[PDB]
Amino acid sequence: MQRQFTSMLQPGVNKFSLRMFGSQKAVEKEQERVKTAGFWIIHPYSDFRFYWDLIMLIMMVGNLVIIPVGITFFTEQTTTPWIIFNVASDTVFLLDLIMNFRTGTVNSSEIILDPKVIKMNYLKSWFVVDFISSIPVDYIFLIVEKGRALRIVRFTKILSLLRLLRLSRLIRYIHQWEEIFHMTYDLASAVVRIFNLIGMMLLLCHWDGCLQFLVPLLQDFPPDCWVSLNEMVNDSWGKQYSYALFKAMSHMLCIGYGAQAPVSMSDLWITMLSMIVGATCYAMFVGHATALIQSLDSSRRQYQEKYKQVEQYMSFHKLPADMRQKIHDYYEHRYQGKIFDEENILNELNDPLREEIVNFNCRKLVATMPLFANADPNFVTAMLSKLRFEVFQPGDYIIREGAVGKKMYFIQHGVAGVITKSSKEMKLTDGSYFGEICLLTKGRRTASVRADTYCRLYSLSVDNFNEVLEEYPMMRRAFETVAIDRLDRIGKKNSILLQKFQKD
Amino acid sequence: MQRQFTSMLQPGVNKFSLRMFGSQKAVEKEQERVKTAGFWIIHPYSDFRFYWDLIMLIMMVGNLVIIPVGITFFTEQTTTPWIIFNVASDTVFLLDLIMNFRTGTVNSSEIILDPKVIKMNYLKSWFVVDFISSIPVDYIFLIVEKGRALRIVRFTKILSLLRLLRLSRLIRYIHQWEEIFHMTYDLASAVVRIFNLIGMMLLLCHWDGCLQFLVPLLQDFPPDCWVSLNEMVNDSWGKQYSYALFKAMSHMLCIGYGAQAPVSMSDLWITMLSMIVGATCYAMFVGHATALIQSLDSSRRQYQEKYKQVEQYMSFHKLPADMRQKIHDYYEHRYQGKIFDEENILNELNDPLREEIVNFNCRKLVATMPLFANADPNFVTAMLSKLRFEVFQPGDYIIREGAVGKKMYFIQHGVAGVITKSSKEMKLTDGSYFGEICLLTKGRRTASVRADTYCRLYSLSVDNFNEVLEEYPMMRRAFETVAIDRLDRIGKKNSILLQKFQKD
Amino acid sequence: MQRQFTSMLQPGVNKFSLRMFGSQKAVEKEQERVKTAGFWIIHPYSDFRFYWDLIMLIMMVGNLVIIPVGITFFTEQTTTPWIIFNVASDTVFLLDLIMNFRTGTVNSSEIILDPKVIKMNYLKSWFVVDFISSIPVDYIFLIVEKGRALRIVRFTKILSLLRLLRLSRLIRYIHQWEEIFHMTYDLASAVVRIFNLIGMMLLLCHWDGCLQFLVPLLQDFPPDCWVSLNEMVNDSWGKQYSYALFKAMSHMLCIGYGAQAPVSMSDLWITMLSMIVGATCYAMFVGHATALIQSLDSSRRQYQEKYKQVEQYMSFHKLPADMRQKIHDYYEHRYQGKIFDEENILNELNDPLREEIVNFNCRKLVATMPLFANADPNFVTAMLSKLRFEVFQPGDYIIREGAVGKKMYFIQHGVAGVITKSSKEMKLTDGSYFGEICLLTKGRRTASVRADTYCRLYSLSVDNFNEVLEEYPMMRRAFETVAIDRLDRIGKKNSILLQKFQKD
Amino acid sequence: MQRQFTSMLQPGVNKFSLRMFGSQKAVEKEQERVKTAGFWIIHPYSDFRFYWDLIMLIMMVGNLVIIPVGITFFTEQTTTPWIIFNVASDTVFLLDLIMNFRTGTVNSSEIILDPKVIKMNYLKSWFVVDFISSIPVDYIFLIVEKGRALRIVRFTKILSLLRLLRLSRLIRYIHQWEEIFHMTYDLASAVVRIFNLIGMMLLLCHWDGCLQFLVPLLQDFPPDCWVSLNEMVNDSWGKQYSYALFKAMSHMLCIGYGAQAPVSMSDLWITMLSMIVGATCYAMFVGHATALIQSLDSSRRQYQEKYKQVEQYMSFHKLPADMRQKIHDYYEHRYQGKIFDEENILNELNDPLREEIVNFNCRKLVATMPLFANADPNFVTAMLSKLRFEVFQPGDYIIREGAVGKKMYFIQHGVAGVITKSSKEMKLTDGSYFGEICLLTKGRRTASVRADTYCRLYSLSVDNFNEVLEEYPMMRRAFETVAIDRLDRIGKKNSILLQKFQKD
Ligand SMILES: Nc1ncnc2c1ncn2[C@@H]1O[C@@H]2COP(=O)(O)O[C@H]2[C@H]1O
């Protein structure tokens, strides 16, 4: 199963991968490139690499949690199981270190050159810290000593603490994979940021708890320390840890001290350090929280902000209360508490998508109308692209009689009434259009039109209409025919239209 | 009164409802849809549902407040009145649970399918938690036991604590109804968010207060606990609660500990937990406050921000101080400390509304002018739509003599003076227009015009004017006539105009 | 001096007033309106009113500071000087109350109707609180009693505390005058908001300090209170106040308790209340600070944000590093770290201002050029309005030979070199223009032009140029002449131009 | 080496300098201006000045750190080394003061007038504070005394504290140079702001630590002070300082008190003051942190915000889930999680840069296409400027057969298939163009085109195409030829094209 291994090493065709590299052909090229170095090089966005990093993360986390505690509260640090654990952990880290040379880096296109690009760049960047972390230094030191004890013991713990420098690597890994996870699952940034901070914060607290206890151990439990004053040196490890952790935590969240304020200088300085660390962390957390909160209601906030401008405008012109109310109502009907700019979004989209959206919007209208179903779909598409959405309140004159008409209408939803001299009352339903005659006749509006209820209309401008009809002269005839009947019903004969019909 | 009940079950025609569903016809359709399931199904936006939720909220709140306290500070938990209270409360919750199957869900259109849509979705979503909360588990356990006591008693309290899981339901309800309340009364989001948080925070504090006391009770008041060290075990319930609450509250708001720092591990851990809960809550509160504050002065802030850009621009070109001052003055006059973009807002509005606004703005002007009152209102409307607002400072040449004039003017407010060679001094008042001759003659400006005080003018561009006058050729004649007299007064005869008049 | 008084009562012609009311004539109208009610009514924006409010504010502040302290720490509350102070203060407040009926309200235009508008609205709005505050209730109570003592004494202090309800009025006044002060001196909003909060916060702290001491006094110094445990009942007033204030302050800023955690319930509850008040206040302060900070660097922040978008764009297209660097350099040269949009700002301004700005920008250019100084200033104005600012980096081909030229140029600043076949090297200085021939000839570019150093140019488009020259055909001749000489120098004869010259 | 000195005094030609002054010629002018005053005046942006300020900053920092400590914890303040240090420090400050008269100020152009502009402005601005700081006042006082001791000693320390007023100058310097450093290295503002605050905060803490100890020293260690209660008067200086610092720091970060709550009034008041200082500082820090955090993820946040609007839009129209998914996919492909507006950025850039960018984008396309490599580069440039980027998803009809075609295409990347009646299957690769025939023929689309995979296309509109081809009629012929072959292959003969070819 070498082929399988090879496949694993190369980048898979994931959704994220596709997004990164565009087409699938492009992905293949990357794979081919990878193939140059055999049974050695690993691509940064590979599946195997992901798995490896996952493996690392758990282990790393454990080490960060467990190691300090082990160093501090357990004096028997040369016992079997512990030793076994340590060596094994070190091995994994060593392996990881080795892998980083095989692993490709990303800066432009990813650096796939094995001996030159990856090795020489990594050796001058992060290799120094990593190497120290990977190797078991304390054990080496012990071996050296082998080939007066208290001092040695004291020294060893500090040396062992070098194994905690793996945190940097962990951080790096998190930063890498989190970016990848944004391009997969569409994560909210703020949430992610807060979670990381929380993880960091807790870790720091833990370290402080360990650290505070540790200094006394290192300093041989002097009587003016906090451990000796409470008389909990001979108490169980767990209790001590808890107390230490509590002490650390208080400083972090700005509560208080331990049993008493620190007496000895060493203790005092440690406390101060913790406070400095803690307070800053807390501040950062607060900031993060604020950011998160702002993000969460950003959609709602924005709308309100936009509306505020409208209010200000009104104030500037000193409009009557009634008028203001009307405007407010209109706004409510139009946007329904949702900020967006159709002009921008539609522009951003491509043609087919736009068509799809438009069709969905006006599907009902299309179904209703007799002209739209029979004619070619291309014509329909042409028509619906040029439409512009409008909302009218009840008691608004949509068209006034005698004016110069720039735009016709299409009733998607609601009921509008027609008013003409000696025409009684005529009411229009959904899937009806009005204002077609003034654009055809090139004259004035034959009669007034006023909305009965709230009317949701799709307007079409004159120029657009003309453009549409230059492409499809057969559809104009139908329109003309429709107009003529309406005119007859009304009682106002348009002569030009009649002439045109005769000609036809 | 079954009809009434049915009506209640169906959605009413509220303002919010109208907003949601658009037209009233649409609302009727929803009602009809609801009617399919008889004496069973309840619509989410129904009036009855609202009332039910209101009923729940009070009760729920009471339970959240009262239950924990009861569990903790009252050992006599099997007494009559308490028992009566508990059972009754449980009944209501059970009823509510039953209702959720009858209640429709909102995701698109609301799911009105009774046996399939509502029941199967809710059973796999929130039913598990709810059911546990509703049932009186402790009593059931007791019954089971009936069909050594201390342990049982200890167990029972924890079981009873399951009744506090109703909080989730409460939260859900709040989230639902708050959305509805945004679409009714136009609430500020930030305020709402803060209030909810406050409610939550207080509740949490209360729980902590209860919780802290509770552990000692559960653990049988060990001598190293905070209750036994203060010697307030046998003190009255209320005092204990207060002290406990105080302790909780301090941790929340980051003040301090109780009488002393916790000695026993159990206490210590509890304290730590509280601190973790408390600190985070505080941070969240701070964030919310920040958000609120930003929202409150957002209208003011924005203006300032906008102005800052202007200042920066000036700095970039390194303008003289005098010039800068002038610009500042202009800005002050123009916007009056109010950020808004007329171009956007007007576009957003529909035609009738625009007309109304324009009319209100220029009502005074219309009243003043002799031409506007006599002519058709359509013409007036056409004119006023195309107008563009402008502000001039005293000592600014509005028109310079001999230039090519692109726009005429209309004095809404202020006083402007005309300057011509051997024309002495002429001053114009509100409701007067100037700059009409260059657009009619299609030549140069006959004389200069300079503002006396601050002038608020409505400009009309040449193209727009032409457009207006192609529709109404009768109004042009009047303009021409007006011009001729003015020309005569001046002493500069325009020949083309004269010719036109002769022709007429 | 009744006339003077009358004048004072009426609104003065301040800058703020002018801004509010527009023209000075308008202000006069307001004064006339005011005149309807004689020796009675006061305008809200009057000078006298301002002075009155100033007088109030100091007094009010003093009362807020002094009264609580007096109530608490001085048992001898019936002494002479104190009595004198109190009565006098009350008198002023009573007078202020009376004034509010005379004072006009602002909602639209300000309500100047004396008996109906001002009196009936204020009587149902804020009169209840105010009246109570104004009257000396404690003294009245004492009088009543006159026409067992300890209880009475206890009662009286609480009654006196009603005089602290003037805070509301103070707040109102501050809110009023701060708005006015925005329209005078162009204050930063955030700063103002923070200052108010600080004032409020300190006041609250003071009250808490007083309040904490006060309860013990009211409760007769019970031995389980904080005052009796420290044994500072018989200590001097000042020390007590300080300690009390300290205690209050700690709760506000989240430090700690007093000497010990509160023992008695009353004390405990008070402490809790203070904490609730304090913590919230602190949160608010933090929010305000955040807001202020964001405001302060908003000009800088915005620029950075804008740039970030550019960077993102570059990243999207995956541009070479060199190219990116070039772009960065260009950006630096163009905007100089200053965000602004000329297109918007210029549109916002009126014509004369624009002209002034343009002239200032291109004054140097005008001075340099021989054509601009001799010709009419109108022509110059026309030219300079249509110009568009551009920046070029050294080594950029401004014009390439043989291309179709849409725009000519004007060198404001920097040095550009001309490159033609067998033309050697020609270098242009400030106040020189190039690219004029392609627009005149209506053909192709005669020769290439490349920048030597960083060149700051003003471009003029073809259409604009044509527009300019239709108005002024005499200036075209000069241009033609200039071109011809250049052509001769080059060695490339343009025939059309020659023909035109011949015709001329 | 006087020439060198002179050079140093004058402004160097740095990058920052260039940015400030534009061209290098301009810089020379500044130098010339500087030359008017000889061996005296120093320019604000000079290199020497920078160095001087750097020198000051270290020294100033040291003084701020060291002086207070010296004043407080060392009673032997008249010893040799200390004296030597003090005098030397004073000398430097005196020199700096002298320099400020020689140093030019910046307000517009920098004030280079030596006796009038720089001296008279600085003498009325900041000279008062500075002078006091510079002079050794304590020593002068001592001298005066020379030409009962305890009181004198007490006095002297306070006088010496005047030397701490150099902080203002330091602040000023920082504010100056930080602005300069923004215009050099493109620093993130937020980071800079936070760092300054941190520096300030620490300094304040230090001062508080010193200050707290100092009052006892001044007050002669009264037994009710915090130093005497802990019995650490005779302890070493360092320990005392640490304890004092700790005490200060706790108040700053809101932890607690020292050993006990303050007993004496003096101590108490000091503590309160510290708390006031501390809390405010902490709040400010929090605000700064928040600002920083918002800045850091602003690029990411913005994108998310933008997307939210899209989501809202979708919600408003109530689109199907499938459709929504499609839209999401499109968005992901198009922008790749990166907010930017090409329309704005490109407008902001100049022509050459745009050309460069466009060329880089379409270099591959150019390489691919046979027509583009052979023809003139000018033509290519013309073509590529007018192109518009578009993205298509697999299964989208790019062109539908029979429609009126407004735009042709260019396949940068991906694979698109052509569909015609009885044409089998034809597939196009990168560097191929389609949609050219409808623009040439001025008719309808000959056949449909649908994307196979994700297609990245560059569209060219009809009008733009026409514009391009009016300039280059030779390139049209090639296009026609290409079309004809394609038509032949298809089987649909276009007659007009054929006619044109014949004519040619
Ligand atoms: N000898 C010259 N001196 C100054 N400018 C020139 C000379 N020759 C050409 N130019 C300018 O360089 C430009 C090149 O393109 P145009 O033909 O648009 O217009 C040309 C002139 O404006």
Side-chain angles (χ1 to χ4, degrees), chain C residues 426 428 434-435 437 444-447 449 486 489:
Chain C
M426 303 182 181
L428 292 165
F434 63 91
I437 297 168
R444 305 309 187 85
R445 299 287 196 179
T446 56
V449 182
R486 288 185 177 189
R489 188 171 292 95

Side-chain angles (χ1 to χ4, degrees), chain A residues 41-74 79 81-82 85-86 88-89 91-93:
Chain A
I41 293 295
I42 297 161
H43 201 258
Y45 305 120
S46 65
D47 193 55
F48 178 62
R49 181 63 173 181
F50 168 74
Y51 275 103
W52 181 245
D53 287 316
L54 185 63
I55 283 166
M56 292 315 301
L57 286 185
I58 294 166
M59 284 291 292
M60 276 181 167
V61 156
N63 284 292
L64 300 182
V65 172
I66 298 295
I67 288 174
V69 174
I71 290 162
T72 49
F73 307 102
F74 302 138
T79 192
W82 200 261
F85 174 92
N86 186 347
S89 71
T91 308
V92 180
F93 293 124

Side-chain angles (χ1 to χ4, degrees), chain C residues 399-400 402-403 405 408-409 418-419 426-428 432-435 437 439-440 443-449 482-483 486-487 489 491:
Chain C
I399 296 168
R400 291 181 179 283
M408 71 180 286
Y409 294 87
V418 185
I419 304 172
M426 303 182 181
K427 299 188 76 173
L428 292 165
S432 305
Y433 70 96
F434 63 91
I437 297 168
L439 308 186
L440 293 161
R444 305 309 187 85
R445 299 287 196 179
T446 56
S448 297
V449 182
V482 173
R486 288 185 177 189
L487 289 172
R489 188 171 292 95

Side-chain angles (χ1 to χ4, degrees), chain A residues 19 23 182 187 193 254-255 257 268-269 279 284 288 294 301 334 338-339 348 350 353 361, chain D residues 242 250 254-255 257 282 293-294 297 300 304-305 312 315-317 330-332 335 391 413 444:
Chain A
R19 206 168 302 171
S23 63
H182 279 296
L187 299 169
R193 292 180 74 79
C254 313
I255 309 305
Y257 310 117
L268 181 68
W269 274 105
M284 290 296 289
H288 275 95
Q294 292 186 191
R301 167 171 65 78
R334 180 64 176 77
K338 298 177 184 177
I339 185 161
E348 288 185 334
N350 63 16
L353 286 171
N361 290 333
Chain D
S242 299
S250 47
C254 313
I255 310 305
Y257 310 117
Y282 191 67
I293 288 167
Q294 292 186 191
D297 66 353
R300 185 83 64 162
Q304 285 191 349
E305 276 195 351
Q312 281 207 321
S315 189
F316 175 69
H317 290 287
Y330 166 78
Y331 261 85
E332 285 174 333
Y335 296 95
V391 171
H413 192 72
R444 305 309 187 85

Side-chain angles (χ1 to χ4, degrees), chain B residues 242 250 254-255 257 282 293-294 297 304-305 312 315-317 320 330-332 335 391 413 444, chain C residues 19 23 182 187 193 254-255 257 268-269 279 284 288 294 301 334 338-339 342 348 350 360-361:
Chain B
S242 299
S250 47
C254 313
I255 310 305
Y257 310 117
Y282 191 67
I293 288 167
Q294 292 186 191
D297 66 353
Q304 285 191 349
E305 276 195 351
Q312 281 207 321
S315 189
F316 175 69
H317 290 287
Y330 166 78
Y331 261 85
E332 285 174 333
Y335 296 95
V391 171
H413 192 72
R444 305 309 187 85
Chain C
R19 206 168 302 171
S23 63
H182 279 296
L187 299 169
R193 292 180 74 79
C254 313
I255 309 305
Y257 310 117
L268 181 68
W269 274 105
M284 290 296 289
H288 275 94
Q294 292 186 191
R301 167 171 65 78
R334 180 64 176 77
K338 298 177 184 177
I339 185 161
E342 300 199 347
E348 288 185 334
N350 63 16
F360 187 79
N361 290 333

